[PDB]
């Protein structure tokens, strides 16, 4: 059964609610982005209207084989009427195709559902600037002050310089980058660009990348592994055993691997600056964990919410424990008292 924080009161609408069977009263199912925890339940047999971005739509059709007659793509930054209700989709600064949804309720209430997002000050100049929001359904993944990490730009700078240094010293080194979902594609695209290489990958991952509307993509990626010195592998294979095994397969073309595991936050963020990050190393294999986040840090979240001044906040992440819920409510009250709304 569908939890309360996935329902939009005063509408026939749900958000990210595909794992519950047929939801009573739901005339339109919204999908914020193509991450498995959120799409869980969709398939080629789904027969209710799905509303989403163009990119999310490409992935539903090609990867999950949802039939085309049930896919309803909407442009961003554009007022649209769905089942008699005005909605807008906004870029969430999460993974490709990820949106926030603004719902203009018939009674005058305005609701923002952030989906998953990485708050940015650029959002303060979107169509959010123009009016008041009564209810915020908020991505609270990192809602605690211990959660700090660098900008995505600093993280990419570190990776480009690390990869370019290693391969310039040793032209026979291979770079490997882990992946398990869409998102974070800047990591491997920036590295391959500095090395003058295409990114090599499996046919399944190439297919996913072809759904994402990335400009000039055919120039950037390939399924011919032997022509490429940046390879993508599943995240689970980014360990000394999996990488040893991969180096065997390359037929004595390479004699060193430098690998990247993009993670979210890890507790080594509580002590170590990005510049100071060092790898784990065994023989001719080195593995870097890099804190590339597609979710708000604590300070980015705080800034966004203090700017928006919602009347009520409903968390969508870390809602399963009393301790989490209590912690989160304390911070919302601080933010409100500090800013005066
Ligand atoms: Ni996500």
Swiss-Prot record:
Location of this chain's protein in the cell: Nucleus
Top-level division of the source organism's lineage: Eukaryota
Record annotation: effect of changing residue 295 to A: Impaired nuclear focus formation, reduced interaction with PIAS and increased sensitivity to cisplatin
Residues that span the membrane, as ranges: none
Tissue expression as described in the entry: Expressed in brain, heart, kidney, liver, pancreas, placenta and skeletal muscle.
Inducing or repressing factors: During mitosis. The mRNA encoding this protein contains an internal ribosome entry site (IRES) in its 5'-UTR. This 5'-UTR generally suppresses translation while specifically promoting expression during mitosis, when cap-dependent translation may be impaired.
Membership in a protein family: Belongs to the DNA repair metallo-beta-lactamase (DRMBL) family.
Oligomer and partners: Binds constitutively to TP53BP1. Binds CDC27, which is itself a component of the anaphase promoting complex (APC). Binds PIAS1.
Function summary: May be required for DNA interstrand cross-link repair. Also required for checkpoint mediated cell cycle arrest in early prophase in response to mitotic spindle poisons. Possesses beta-lactamase activity, catalyzing the hydrolysis of penicillin G and nitrocefin. Exhibits no activity towards other beta-lactam antibiotic classes including cephalosporins (cefotaxime) and carbapenems (imipenem).
Name of the protein this chain belongs to: DNA cross-link repair 1A protein
Gene assigned in the entry: DCLRE1A
Full protein stretch here: 700 to 1040 of 1040
